[PDB]
Amino acid sequence: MNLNIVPLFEKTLSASDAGRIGRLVLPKACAEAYFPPISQSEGIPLKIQDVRGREWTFQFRYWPNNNSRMYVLEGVTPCIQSMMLQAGDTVTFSRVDPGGKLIMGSRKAA
């Protein structure tokens, strides 16, 4: 089977996602559908490569939130400013199949 880019989901950056804290909140449904299942709040390192070949390492983890969870990527600040993104800009998460290799890209708000 030939390689194919398959889009997974996107996140429109909030002020919190794009600012000094360096944590991006992932939509819960998307994180649970498409990223690796994680059982422990601490999470796992997650490697995601962009079209310019840069491989970014995030920590994919969650926060307990009432009896539920919020999922986040920690360590996103180098990625966000290397791409000149701000609040309102969009990050796209995709996969290369077969393989399931995670990739990403972004676009500026209209």
Place this chain on the structure above:
DNA sequence: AGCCATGCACCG
């Protein structure tokens, strides 16, 4: 019902 943007306590 409960996501998710952001507030905020407290631990080191």
Place this chain on the structure above:
DNA sequence: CGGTGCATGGCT
């Protein structure tokens, strides 16, 4: 006392 880890509240 700055950041981590979670709480709180706007919103649908």
